[PDB]
């Protein structure tokens, strides 16, 4: 072989897209959960 | 009061009172004990941390015979087990030295014998005793009135 094998580039863009989607879905979900918690805290503070 | 207001025991000591209002039982969470009535001992008490109180649905026999809450609160004087309790400026007080620990959960009564609040604690303010109590509201809103230095009875 005439070139070394790296890692940051030796992963297909399609596979990268799938991996990013399945890793970002949970991140978006937890962000939404924190947003909902904050909104609930604001509502309960306002309506106490 | 006497018919529909049940003490909570602990080691044979009363440490609060439970009230059945609007077809549902309520008990305060800061107090720990055993409910007197056996029939209500089997009710699964859904807990509401913000209201420091658990509520449950009473059985069929007793759901007909309950106290009614009220929303409207004309300012002035209100009935209580320990006499008349005073309401002004969106705050409930009593003459000082009246009420204490173990009186938690005793309802506040009005002229027509309907509930307007439930006593949870007090702050002794020297002249009177500010009472931390949960109340209703015109918009059908439950609010936990708590003065500074509230001591949960």
From Swiss-Prot, chain B:
Residues the record lists as Phosphoserine modifications: 2
Annotated positions of the Phosphothreonine modification: 5
Ranges of residues in domain Peptidase S3: 4-153
Site (Involved in dimerization of the capsid protein): 78, 111
Known role: Forms an icosahedral capsid with a T=4 symmetry composed of 240 copies of the capsid protein surrounded by a lipid membrane through which penetrate 80 spikes composed of trimers of E1-E2 heterodimers. The capsid protein binds to the viral RNA genome at a site adjacent to a ribosome binding site for viral genome translation following genome release. Possesses a protease activity that results in its autocatalytic cleavage from the nascent structural protein.
Domain notes: The very N-terminus plays a role in the particle assembly process. The N-terminus also contains a nuclear localization signal and a supraphysiological nuclear export signal (supraNES), which is an unusually strong NES that mediates host CRM1 binding in the absence of RanGTP and thus can bind CRM1, not only in the nucleus, but also in the cytoplasm. The C-terminus functions as a protease during translation to cleave itself from the translating structural polyprotein.
This protein's name: Capsid protein
Lineage: Viruses, Riboviria, Orthornavirae, Kitrinoviricota, Alsuviricetes
């Amino acid at each position: 072989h005439k070139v070394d094998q790296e890692f940051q580039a030796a992963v297909s863009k399609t596979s990268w897209n799938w991996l990013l989607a399945l890793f970002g879905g949970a991140s978006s979900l937890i962000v939404v959960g924190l947003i909902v918690l904050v909104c609930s805290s604001m509502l309960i503070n306002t309506r106490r | 009061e006497s018919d529909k207001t049940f003490p909570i025991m602990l080691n044979g000591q009363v440490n609060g009172y439970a009230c059945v209002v609007g077809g549902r039982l309520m008990k305060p969470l800061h107090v720990e004990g055993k409910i007197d009535n056996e029939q209500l001992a089997a009710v699964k008490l859904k807990k509401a941390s913000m209201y420091d109180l658990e509520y449950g649905d009473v059985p069929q026999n007793m759901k007909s015979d309950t106290l009614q809450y009220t929303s409207d609160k004309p300012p002035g004087f209100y009935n209580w087990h320990h006499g008349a309790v005073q309401y002004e400026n969106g705050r409930f007080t009593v003459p000082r030295g009246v009420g204490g620990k173990g009186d938690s959960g005793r309802p506040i009564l009005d002229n027509r014998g309907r509930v307007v609040a439930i006593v949870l604690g007090g702050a002794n303010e020297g002249t009177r005793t500010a009472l931390s109590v949960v109340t209703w509201n015109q918009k059908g809103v439950t609010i936990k009135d708590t003065p500074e230095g509230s001591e949960p009875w």
